[PDB]
Design a protein around this ligand. Structure first.
Ligand SMILES: CCCCCCCC/C=C\CCCCCCCC(=O)OC[C@H](O)CO
Ligand SMILES: CCCCCCCC/C=C\CCCCCCCC(=O)OC[C@H](O)CO
Ligand SMILES: CCCCCCCC/C=C\CCCCCCCC(=O)OC[C@H](O)CO
Ligand SMILES: CCCCCCCC/C=C\CCCCCCCC(=O)OC[C@H](O)CO
Ligand SMILES: CCCCCCCC/C=C\CCCCCCCC(=O)OC[C@H](O)CO
Ligand SMILES: CCCCCCCC/C=C\CCCCCCCC(=O)OC[C@H](O)CO
Ligand SMILES: CCCCCCCC/C=C\CCCCCCCC(=O)OC[C@H](O)CO
Ligand SMILES: CCCCCCCC/C=C\CCCCCCCC(=O)OC[C@H](O)CO
Ligand SMILES: CCCCCCCC/C=C\CCCCCCCC(=O)OC[C@H](O)CO
Ligand SMILES: CCCCCCCC/C=C\CCCCCCCC(=O)OC[C@H](O)CO
Ligand SMILES: CCCCCCCC/C=C\CCCCCCCC(=O)OC[C@H](O)CO
Ligand SMILES: CCCCCCCC/C=C\CCCCCCCC(=O)OC[C@H](O)CO
Ligand SMILES: *C/C=C(C)/C=C/C=C(C)/C=C/C1=C(C)CCCC1(C)C
Ligand SMILES: *C/C=C(C)/C=C/C=C(C)/C=C/C1=C(C)CCCC1(C)C
Ligand SMILES: *C/C=C(C)/C=C/C=C(C)/C=C/C1=C(C)CCCC1(C)C
Ligand SMILES: *C/C=C(C)/C=C/C=C(C)/C=C/C1=C(C)CCCC1(C)C
Ligand SMILES: *C/C=C(C)/C=C/C=C(C)/C=C/C1=C(C)CCCC1(C)C
Ligand SMILES: CCCCCCCCCCCCCCCCCCCC
Ligand SMILES: CCCCCCCCCCCCCCCCCCCC
Ligand SMILES: CCCCCCCCCCCCCCCCCCCC
Ligand SMILES: CCCCCCCCCCCCCCCCCCCC
Ligand SMILES: CCCCCCCCCCCCCCCCCCCC
Ligand SMILES: CCCCCCCCCCCCCCCCCCCC
Ligand SMILES: CCCCCCCCO[C@@H]1O[C@H](CO)[C@@H](O)[C@H](O)[C@H]1O
Ligand SMILES: CCCCCCCCO[C@@H]1O[C@H](CO)[C@@H](O)[C@H](O)[C@H]1O
Ligand SMILES: CCCCCCCCO[C@@H]1O[C@H](CO)[C@@H](O)[C@H](O)[C@H]1O
Ligand SMILES: CCCCCCCCO[C@@H]1O[C@H](CO)[C@@H](O)[C@H](O)[C@H]1O
Ligand SMILES: CCCCCCCCO[C@@H]1O[C@H](CO)[C@@H](O)[C@H](O)[C@H]1O
Ligand code: NA
Ligand code: NA
Ligand code: NA
Ligand code: NA
Ligand code: NA
Lengths: 273, 273, 273, 273, 273
């Protein structure tokens, strides 16, 4: 049938269908996703007063991000279950178009909150040295936006036009590297003039940041990481994508936020952990 | 097919249908919309105590507006997905009337909260000089209401009766200019007798106000901004409209609110920024 | 078609149908309704500490009322859209009985919260002189209940049995007048021994109370206020009814609550307006 | 139609159907139910600080109960409207089995929260004299559970097996009397050594407790209180049952909680009424 | 019918169907489940300040767990009612595949929150002696994850491949024993150097922990605990499973959390129990 500029899930769903395990796992992992986020929201609110006033914007922005991620991951969980329906005769879930086609683009546009705010929020915990606060912020936000928007365009074509897919993906990748560059700078300047404890945390944060954020382009490419007609262009690839998103999401948002909160505590004049 | 006094989305949806990208983007952008608003709600609540008591009503009214905008943008997101359904044979989303016709009027009536409160809330941060508080408030609220109501009538006719569309739109425009007039006055008087920092912010606020509020009549006209049978009388126009609303909404509500909060901090005896 | 003891909306919906504008407006105005209430809830909670402890129960009861009204107006918004479905052939929304018949009775029973609490809450702001607190409360609550219950019975018959409609309506009206009587007493005793500012507010409150509460029996009668086969026994009447309810609801609950809060501030030893 | 071990509502719904008034009222009264509970939740949270620390657990447990009752009464409201659908030809609502059969058992299992917590919470306000706190608590909780569970079994058979219905009901009744016994003791010991004001409240509480709790077995029996083929084995009985539950629910939970809160205030060293 | 790697509920549902009592009870018990959790959330938040600051993370993590469990138990309640639909002709609820197959796997992945956090949270109340905080945490979290993941795989095969079911189950059991081991250690070291009161509570906690956590593998095995074609491979088994989960859930999460909170109070320098 005619699907157009649609994500590859819909093509697997339309031709092969999804096994019980594939369908159910994808459902479960998204559910866990949004559950984590709402739990995180509660955590971050409830721990605001654990750090000095000046650090508390970090907690607030964590919370802001949790709201975004919850809403999206919740919405997307429902989108999954609507888009694919059990066929009794063969015993697999197939594309149910009355439910709309499944699209990962929901995530992308919601990153226009998540990404800016996640990058922003560190600047409230660490002190810069040679770099200017506003300058860093603006670079983060610009490159962030450009990264997302270009990627957002790309992913529409991941099946329909593999060239556009990769080119847009490439362009996106450029801006991603820019962000990585700037964040490294930030983390180094952050380490300057703070206890060894805080420096250890920032080291961890950087590793977390680097891995977790890298997963996202991983998910982008997921169906094609085993080349043409590969293992991953399958229900197995579908599962993998949503798993990776969920790991990325938990890492890049919740754990990131927790570490920052721990950093803020060390840097806090009253407070101890 | 008889549609009557219906928005142009329904006509595009009924004749041409929407591509994957068009349908999905519109869906995504509204989702982002309401996500932003609920995140904003949390922000504004959580930052109430960042400013002196006398300023805190600004935070509260921001919050009030966020609730309104969330509920509406959420409701409207659902309305979009209900009103247009995938047709397998051609691979486009077409008007599904069992879901009701799509209408932008939801926004308009909900502005009867948003507009009054947004205009009101500045009067709790800035001090007037030559203008009377009650006088400004009453002018805002009257012209606000008249603007919205006349526009609300107009938009029902954007397809069915182009004349009514434009005339009502014109009348609305009058009241809009009145508001612009009064807000300018407010901003100027606001700048009098406050730090240069606060004056810079109010300068920014005015630019934000002017652009963001102007987008709304832009969205009004969107289908016809490329004239008859133009580029924008199409799924491309539909997308554009909802994008512009979302940019307007985020600018005029969230960012506006944030700037005011920053102003309130500068004006605050305790606090610095 | 056999509808029985049903509200007149269902008869208009079943015979003539509703135009786009009629259906959409009714939908919009209810949406605005419940939006206002949830915004109000936030306001009243967030402003508790703006008045002296003894007054804060007024804020709490406002909040209680907002919860009720939100839930109801939300539920009723959904009931509207479920009860009437677009017919493609003629281009009007007709009764969809699979969605249940539309009934205004939802409002009425929910008044068993709203009315008692709204009458109650003033007694926490004003001081009585010659009247006993418990006595006033009991008169309010009794007459309130009797008003609502009798009206609730009436409205089931507004089409099926015009006599029952009017008789029950009459009986209700009696109890309504009793309430008006007692509230006037309260307002006068309230004015005794308080500043001219507070007296001005109570004057306004009384006018608000009188008009806003009177709208409700206005809505009761709405289909018949232009007599038989009148202008208002039509989709135009349907719109009018729900508009009037929404104006009444906002006036009698939110604005009422705001004014009381303003009164409480004047009467507050610390605080000024 | 084979219905089996189902509540009598489903039998009325399946044979006679429900009139507009019957269906709509049942819908309204459940809606009011859950509205009241959520309003109560807000109240009890918002008034925590109105009593001395030692009493505040009463407020918290009230709140706990409100959450339970809201969720259930909400869920049950939706169950009602799903289970019965308008038939156009005769103009009555009939059993719609695609919506599941209606069952009152939802209430019962949720009492496993409500009952224990309601009995518990008084023990935080009154001081016992003769009796041991833990001892009373354990008797309450055991007899509570046994009451509910036996009743829960009973009500499945209220149509299918009248004998089982009554026997289980009887057994339940035993445990109920035990609770009444213990609560009386508690209330008497509570009155010992406190002001006459507080003693008056506890007198009221006991009357409230006794009536409100007794309604519940009243609702159990409701269809059969006018014997076989009686007035109440009808849509009129259905209405009655849900009305009685709602009165019971509001009395036994909200009002009960309010009175306890008032008692706590009198007993409070700081505070006065 | 072809069901594949599906839970046994779906097989009972597809062949025998569920009686009124079976279907309704399963529905009720899940509803009670999620009700309990949301009530718990409120409790744990509202009692944060009953213990010394250092203990309050226990309250917060309890709360985190409640959010998770609520969302899941809620989602699963809805999944139950969607997956099984009344058949009029025979009067039983049968598998409705348009609702998706029922799967218990939702629980399992959500344990990836619950388990880590429940194990973690004790380490904020007790002081270790010979064991290292980080060491215990890491063992808990690793073995926890491995337990869940292996079990999660197992349960997909509980019908389709009894061998895989048991093997994976066995592997899981290994990791479970490891956790039991570590928790015992923790409890003993916890008891060292604290009051007799605190020691009593930890004794209770251990018993609670041991029983409640053991129920979960009980539920795993439930359909087969009466061997082949046993009593429990039936609607009776289905009921039993969900009952056991609910008991487990309330015990292992809510009561566990309460006891820890009580412990924290005894250990609290300010406060008394
Ligand atoms: C700016 C980057 C725009 C890159 C867009 C790529 C266009 C493209 O790939 O066109 C393929 C062609 O249609 C045959 O496959
Ligand atoms: C598409 C645009 C994305 C919208 C971005 C955030 C929405 C959530 C609102 C949170 C606003 C945070 C702004 C902020 O953090 O500013 C701190 C302030 O400047 C120091 O006092
Ligand atoms: C301040 C209050 C505004 C009062 C009246 C505005 C009347 C505006 C009505 C404009 C309707 C124009 C119209 O309907 O056009 C005529 C014809 O149908 C085209 O083909
Ligand atoms: C008070 C609201 C007034 C409502 C006024 C509605 C006027 C609508 C209008 O302008 O008429 C256009 C139509 O095409 C002409 O037949
Ligand atoms: C962004 C919105 C502004 C206008 C949208 C830009 C035009 C649509 C972009 C596009 O991809 O056009 C292809 C077609 O609309 C679908 O396949
Ligand atoms: C078109 C694409 C724009 C999308 C994201 C930009 C992210 C920026 C949104 C953040 C808004 C918060 C804000 O404006 O804060 C100002 C503050 O004063 C600063 O220090
Ligand atoms: C007590 C009031 C009862 C009024 C009943 C009523 O008005 O009945 C009208 C009659 O049925 C018209 O034919
Ligand atoms: C049957 C329909 C009737 C439904 C009505 C119940 C309203 C529900 C919740 C409001 C919470 C209860 C509010 C009661 C206030 C009583 C009060 O405030 O008196 C003590 C005061 O606190 C001294 O300080
Ligand atoms: C103690 C448990 C005994 C309670 C069980 C009662 C069962 C019952 O009432 O059976 C009636 C009889 O089967 C009518 O034909
Ligand atoms: C058919 C039944 C009709 C139902 C509608 C009837 C109205 C009842 C409304 C609220 C009751 C709330 C319970 C409050 C009871 C305690 C009131 C109280 O204690 O009085 C205030 C006190 O004097 C100040 O400190
Ligand atoms: C320790 C962690 C993983 C163990 C890895 C080994 C996994 C062993 C799984 C055994 C299995 O899957 O069983 C096959 C089934 O019996 C065919 O009929
Ligand atoms: C992660 C590895 C997935 C393990 C699943 C393998 C399995 O146990 O499948 C049973 C049997 O081999 C298939 O019919
Ligand atoms: C909480 C969400 C986060 C941190 C999202 C991060 C997203 C990215 C780092 C996306 C990166 C991409 C590329 C660099 C290539 C493909 C397109 C993107 C946008 C997925
Ligand atoms: C948060 C929502 C806001 C700030 C809405 C503002 C709306 C306007 C400024 C609307 C203006 C209009 C015109 C001036 C012409 C066309 C009709 C309107 C109402 C869209
Ligand atoms: C917030 C809701 C309020 C204030 C509701 C007030 C309702 C009334 C004043 C109803 C009055 C009625 C009559 C006096 C005649 C017809 C029957 C009623 C109940 C609508
Ligand atoms: C908030 C809910 C409450 C207070 C529920 C109370 C329930 C009862 C007192 C039930 C009593 C019953 C009998 C004594 C006989 C029939 C079976 C029961 C459980 C309905
Ligand atoms: C709040 C949820 C909790 C405490 C869940 C605990 C889950 C377990 C202890 C699961 C144990 C299992 C086995 C040891 C064997 C079968 C597979 C599992 C995962 C059910
Ligand atoms: C293309 C999207 C534009 C991104 C906006 C980020 C610019 C940063 C401006 C911030 C000024 C405070
Ligand atoms: C799923 C494992 C991650 C795949 C790594 C591929 C990332 C490519 C990033 C390009 C920049
Ligand atoms: C739809 C395009 C409208 C953009 C308006 C830009 C605002 C300019 C006001 C200065
Ligand atoms: C003292 C105990 C009195 C309690 C009254 C309970 C009556 C319940 C019966 C149901 C009401 C009759 C409806 C027809
Ligand atoms: C099966 C019903 C279990 C009831 C749990 C209700 C959830 C709220 C938990 C409150 C626990 C109350 C104990 C307080 C004692 C602390 C002093
Ligand atoms: C500072 C905190 C350090 C935490 C370390 C704890 C690590 C626990 C993470 C568990 C990851 C388990 C990976 C399982 C691999 C999948 C194998 C499944 C068998 C088929
Ligand atoms: C850097 C990673 C990008 C690798 C691109 C792999 C190219 C895959 O190629 C595509 O594989 C699909 C899956 O079977 C086929 O259906 C398509 O016809 C084919 O174009
Ligand atoms: C200020 C901007 C208003 C300009 C009005 C443009 C006139 C549009 O003209 C309209 O275009 C529609 C779509 O192309 C056609 O379907 C209509 O028949 C036509 O009247
Ligand atoms: C206080 C105002 C009450 C006025 C009562 C007027 C009764 C109107 O009369 C009614 O009008 C309906 C609508 O046209 C008709 O359908 C009814 O058959 C007719 O009885
Ligand atoms: C304590 C009060 C218990 C009285 C129970 C006796 C009434 C049982 O009467 C029942 O009435 C039903 C409908 O009316 C009939 O369908 C049953 O056949 C009949 O047993
Ligand atoms: C306690 C853990 C081991 C239990 C293994 C019991 C073996 C169950 O055996 C299974 O029972 C099903 C239900 O009757 C049958 O339908 C299957 O054919 C059979 O494989
Ligand atoms: Na599905
Ligand atoms: Na759709
Ligand atoms: Na509709
Ligand atoms: Na129905
Ligand atoms: Na069902």
């Amino acid at each position: 049938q005619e699907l157009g500029n649609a994500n590859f899930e819909n093509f697997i769903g339309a031709t092969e269908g999804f096994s019980e395990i594939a369908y159910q796992f994808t459902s479960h992992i998204l559910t866990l996703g949004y559950a984590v986020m709402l739990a995180g929201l509660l955590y971050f609110i409830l721990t605001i007063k654990n750090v000095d006033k000046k650090f508390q914007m970090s907690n607030i922005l964590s919370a802001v991000v949790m709201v975004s991620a919850f809403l999206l991951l919740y919405a997307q969980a429902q989108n999954w279950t609507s888009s694919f329906t059990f066929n009794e005769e063969v015993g697999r879930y197939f594309l149910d178009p009355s439910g709309d086609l499944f699209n990962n683009g929901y995530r992308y546009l919601n990153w226009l909150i998540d990404v800016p705010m996640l990058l922003f929020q560190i600047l409230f915990v660490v002190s810069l040295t040679t770099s200017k606060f506003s300058s860093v912020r603006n670079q983060f936000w610009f490159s962030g936006a450009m990264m997302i928007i270009t990627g957002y365009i790309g992913q529409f074509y991941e099946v329909s036009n593999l060239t556009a897919f990769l080119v847009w993906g490439a362009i996106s990748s450029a801006f991603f590297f820019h962000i990585l560059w700037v964040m490294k700078k930030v983390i180094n300047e952050g380490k300057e003039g703070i206890s060894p404890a805080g420096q250890k945390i920032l080291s961890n944060i950087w590793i977390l940041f680097l891995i977790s954020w890298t997963l996202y382009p991983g998910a982008y490419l997921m169906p094609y990481l085993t080349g043409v007609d590969g293992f991953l262009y399958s229900e197995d690839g579908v599962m993998a994508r949503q798993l990776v998103y969920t790991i990325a999401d938990v890492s890049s948002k919740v754990i990131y936020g927790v570490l920052l909160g721990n950093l803020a505590i060390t840097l806090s004049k009253n407070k101890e952990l």
